[PDB]
Amino acid sequence: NKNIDTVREIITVASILIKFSREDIVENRANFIAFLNEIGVTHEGRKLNQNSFRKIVSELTQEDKKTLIDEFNEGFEGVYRYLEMYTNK
């Protein structure tokens, strides 16, 4: 629906790669975007574009992030340092 929904399922997904200890895929946004289209993570039901990716992950409000922090306590903490930093453009 909005931005969080998509970040949400890419949080789980990239924590798979963290679970398997393949943080290298996570370590670059573009490689990861490609990876996104490949395994089929969509935004608003559409394919996920390079610019429109960066706006989803980065431009979130504090609210959206608190909502992730509340539901994905330990999970988002770690992987959201990773996801944030690797798309510090």
- In the complex, the residues that contact a second copy under the rule CB under 8 A are 5, 8-9, 11-13, 15-17, 19-20, 38-42, 45-46, 70-76
Tell me whether residue 17 or residue 83 sits nearer to a second copy (CB atom). Answer: 17
d(C-alpha 39, C-alpha 10), whole Å: 11
Name the minimum Å distance from CB 84 to a second copy: 16
CB 82 within 8 A of CB 26: yes
Tell me whether residue 70 or residue 88 sits nearer to a second copy (CB atom). Answer: 70
Name the minimum Å distance from CB 5 to a second copy: 8
Name the minimum Å distance from CB 54 to a second copy: 19
How many Cα atoms occupy the beta-carbon half-sphere of 32 within 13 Å?
Answer: 26
Q: What is the DSSP string of 1-45?
A: --SHHHHHHHHHHHHHHHHTT-HHHHT-HHHHHHHHHHHT--SSS
Tell me whether residue 45 or residue 62 sits nearer to a second copy (CB atom). Answer: 45
